[PDB]
Amino acid sequence: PLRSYSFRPTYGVGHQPYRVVVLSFELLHAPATVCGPKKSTN
Amino acid sequence: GYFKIYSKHTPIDLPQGFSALEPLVDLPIGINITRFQTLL
């Protein structure tokens, strides 16, 4: 049912190991708890 | 969607006095509390 990528260190750029991080987000009515740094001045 | 707990501890039916509970913890929890039970 499923085959294998099988990369080599000589493949064309083409089919080369590419890492992917999908950062799905949420906006449910439940309170937000993930936020950015929120920089601060002096 | 926030779970808030206020608390106060005193040394002493219930006492016939006034004391205001202070904020202990607000937690972003997320559940929809409908029932509860004590643990001893």
Curated annotation (Swiss-Prot), chain B:
Domain of life, per lineage: Viruses
Known outcome of mutating A20V: In strain: 20A.EU1
Residues bearing carbohydrate: N32
Protein task: Attaches the virion to the cell membrane by interacting with host receptor, initiating the infection. The major receptor is host ACE2. When S2/S2' has been cleaved, binding to the receptor triggers direct fusion at the cell membrane. When S2/S2' has not been cleaved, binding to the receptor results in internalization of the virus by endocytosis using host TFRC and GRM2 and leading to fusion of the virion membrane with the host endosomal membrane. Alternatively, may use NRP1/NRP2 and integrin as entry receptors.
Subunit structure comment from the entry: Binds to host ACE2. RBD also interacts with the N-linked glycan on 'Asn-90' of ACE2. Cleavage of S generates a polybasic C-terminal sequence on S1 that binds to host Neuropilin-1 (NRP1) and Neuropilin-2 (NRP2) receptors. Interacts with host integrin alpha-5/beta-1 (ITGA5:ITGB1) and with ACE2 in complex with integrin alpha-5/beta-1 (ITGA5:ITGB1). May interact via cytoplasmic c-terminus with M protein. May interact (via N-terminus) with host bilirubin and biliverdin, thereby preventing antibody binding to the SARS-CoV-2 spike NTD via an allosteric mechanism.
Name assigned to this protein: Spike protein S1
UniProt organism field: Severe acute respiratory syndrome coronavirus 2 (2019-nCoV)
Location of this fragment in the whole protein: 199 to 242 of 1273
